[PDB]
């Protein structure tokens, strides 16, 4: 019988271990505050503007 | 040395030439060392030249 020496080939075709989709980071108000250095206790105060009545 | 002139004994006290010495040693290591965590370097350091290197 004919006998041949062949390379066991390996391919990546797009089969990935199943892990959940990432949605929440895009849906949440992300990084409106950045200058967290140069702020006491890593805390940035957020000011909520005043409301007046007529 | 001095000896009496016309002295019956004629021995001379031979002088000695002794060279002296002293050692100078390199024996100290002066250092200033600083340790900054990733939080301290990221958030607490602003310049790092006038805040770390100059001190």
Q: Which string of b and e fits A21-53 if b means at least 16 CB within 10 Å?
A: eeeeeeeeeeeeeeeeeeeeeeeeeeeeeeeee
Q: How far apart are CA B39 and CA B53, in angstroms?
A: 18
Q: Which two tokens stand for residue B32?
A: 């200033």
Q: CA of A6, closest CA in chain B: separation in Å?
A: 52
Give A-chain residues touching B46 at CB under 8 angstroms. 37-38
- Residue B42 contacts A, CB cutoff 8 Å: yes
Which distant-in-sequence residues (6+ apart) come within 8 Å of A9 by Cβ? none
Tokens of B2: 């001095």
Residue A28 tokens, joined: 């949440």
Please answer yes or no on whether B46 and A37 come within 8 Å at the CB atom.
yes
Query: B39, B40, B42, B43: best mutation site toward chain A, by most A Cβ within 10 Å?
Result: B43
């Amino acid at each position: 019988a004919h006998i041949f020496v062949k390379p066991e080939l390996v391919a990546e075709i797009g089969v990935k271990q199943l892990q959940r989709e990432i949605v929440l980071p895009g849906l949440v108000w992300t990084n409106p505050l950045t200058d967290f250095g140069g702020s006491k206790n890593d805390t940035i105060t957020v000011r909520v503007p005043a409301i007046t009545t007529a | 040395n001095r000896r009496d002139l016309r002295d019956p004994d004629r021995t001379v006290i031979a002088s000695e030439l002794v060279e002296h010495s002293f050692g100078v040693t390199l024996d100290k290591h002066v250092y200033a060392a600083l340790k900054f965590t990733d939080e301290q370097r990221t958030l607490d350091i602003r310049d790092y030249t006038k805040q770390v290197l100059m001190p």
